[PDB]
């Protein structure tokens, strides 16, 4: 992985040694070049994962997440450089450094072969993320949002640290390849019930699981746009990726420990979808949309079927691009009217016709219009949960209906109707804003032509 780790680090010298007026051009261009080379990770085999060294390996699960992560860095740079224009030069370079360091921790997190190396990097992403939210957020509440984000995560992570170290003691290793062959079954006992909880609660909080999700709408509403992009696109998927790996050693206890969390997700997804119908804040609506989508991922990981794992892998990638696009779309409105109130600026399709096309495409992927990968992921999950229990189609069906209602409600309220009279600073969409939107939707729609590369190890 050094062909990706090292050039990612070299982005830091590049940013700091760039001319004062070229920090965005240089960092954006060279982070796109790194994104290009990440496609070499798709040298995947039918039987064996791609194991580079004792430290790093890349299978079909981590490969698409790595490519999503490295694609997101250039997009985040494009999305931030407007609202950071008045920033002090050094504080602009420190902002970019926080994003580069986040990418560094992320690509190492997704390829760590040892679970305790995964834990440290998994935890290391907190610091740059927290600093972005609290230093470069705009509102007073960004400070409270930082604390909720920090302490929700740590409340779960610290038990996970104890469980992993206990697992290394008893099994002798935490290398994920070794665990595949040395895994022993988990037999019922209160001791194992809490080993199971410690291994899964840290990841449940990151997804987040319904009930434990309150940190997420706070963080999104306060984060800067680049922070919201990485939060929704990648950092949520650290929970999913971690769960997909650790469940290997939790069998067969996962048979009955899953029930309380499937119930929370199946019911929680209807509850958070319905919350979206009455949200007044556009960013908060998108945040609650992520909770509903990630509920499906939690259910799919817990029912442990080949179809559900394929569906979860596609959902994580599809959600990553769609939710990131939606936050970017809402941000472009915010940079004009400087409010997140959804009902404030209406009828924008009249004033920004092409940006209204992006709003349409983003909404269609969010409601999972076939054959988007949003629909492929969501459909595969629904097929597998139906076999788990037929009655789940009722809850899946209702969520699909409510998901369409709030997706098109967001489209209709902001883009259609009459424009707000007194709002007269809706300038024409910039090239930067249109290119940012297209760099989200075009790769998302292109992946429909070749969806096998985002279906994960069980394809």
């Amino acid at each position: 992985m050094l062909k990706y780790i090292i050039p990612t680090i070299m982005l830091m010298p590049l940013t700091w040694l760039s001319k004062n007026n070229m920090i965005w051009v240089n960092s954006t261009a060279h982070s796109l070049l790194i994104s290009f080379t990440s496609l070499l990770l798709m040298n995947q085999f039918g039987d064996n994962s791609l194991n580079f060294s004792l430290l790093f390996f890349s299978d079909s699960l981590s490969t698409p997440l790595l490519i999503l992560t490295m694609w997101l860095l250039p997009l985040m740079l494009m999305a931030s450089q407007h609202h950071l224009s008045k920033e002090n030069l050094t504080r602009k370079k420190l902002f970019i450094t926080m994003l580069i360091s986040l990418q560094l921790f992320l690509i190492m997190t997704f390829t760590a072969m040892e679970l305790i190396l995964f834990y440290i990097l998994f935890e290391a992403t907190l610091v740059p993320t927290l600093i972005i939210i609290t230093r470069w957020g705009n509102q007073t509440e960004r400070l409270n949002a930082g604390l909720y984000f920090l302490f929700y995560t740590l409340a779960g992570s610290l038990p996970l640290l104890v469980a992993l170290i206990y697992i290394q003691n008893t099994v002798g290793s935490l290398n994920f390849l070794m665990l595949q062959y040395w895994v022993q079954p988990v037999h019922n006992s209160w001791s194992n019930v809490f080993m199971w909880l410690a291994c899964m609660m840290a990841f449940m909080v990151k997804m987040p699981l319904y009930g434990l999700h309150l940190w997420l709408p706070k963080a999104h509403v306060e984060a800067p746009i680049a922070g919201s992009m990485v939060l929704a696109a990648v950092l949520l998927k650290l929970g999913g990726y971690g769960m997909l790996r650790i469940t290997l050693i939790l069998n067969p206890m996962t048979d009955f420990m899953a029930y309380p969390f499937i119930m929370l997700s199946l019911w929680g997804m209807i509850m958070t979808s319905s919350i979206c119908l009455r949200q007044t804040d556009l960013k908060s609506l998108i945040a609650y949309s992520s909770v509903s989508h990630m509920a499906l991922v939690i259910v799919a990981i817990l029912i442990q079927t080949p179809w559900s794992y394929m569906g979860a892998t596609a959902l994580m990638i599809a959600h990553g691009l769609t939710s990131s696009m939606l936050f970017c779309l809402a941000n472009s409105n915010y940079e004009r009217i400087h409010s997140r109130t959804m009902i404030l600026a209406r009828g924008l399709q009249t004033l920004l016709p092409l940006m209204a096309t992006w709003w349409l495409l983003a909404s269609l992927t969010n409601l999972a219009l076939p054959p988007t990968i949003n629909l492929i992921g969501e459909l595969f999950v629904v097929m597998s949960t139906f076999s788990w229990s037929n009655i789940t189609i009722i809850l899946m069906g209702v969520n699909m209906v409510i998901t369409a209602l709030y997706s098109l409600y967001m489209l209709i309220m902001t883009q259609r109707g009459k424009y707000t009279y007194h709002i007269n600073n809706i300038s024409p969409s910039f090239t930067r804003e249109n290119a940012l939107m297209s760099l989200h939707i075009l790769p998302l729609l292109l992946l429909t032509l070749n969806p096998k590369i985002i279906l994960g190890p069980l394809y």
Binding site: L54, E114, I116, L117
Partner: protein
């Protein structure tokens, strides 16, 4: 014919011949516990280094 010893004579350490056998275990000592088995051999590099978690050295 008794001669008085000189100053320093009676404080001399003298040798005495005896036909009594020297005691073997005057303290009545028990047998001393055996020492811990000595660790000997050629110091080789640690196998695969520290082996602490993920570290490869």
């Amino acid at each position: 014919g008794w001669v008085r010893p000189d100053l320093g004579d009676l404080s001399k350490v003298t040798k005495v011949k005896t036909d009594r056998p020297l005691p073997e275990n005057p303290y009545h000592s028990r047998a001393r516990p055996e020492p811990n088995p000595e660790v000997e051999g050629d110091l080789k590099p640690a196998r695969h280094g520290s082996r602490l978690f993920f570290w490869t050295m």
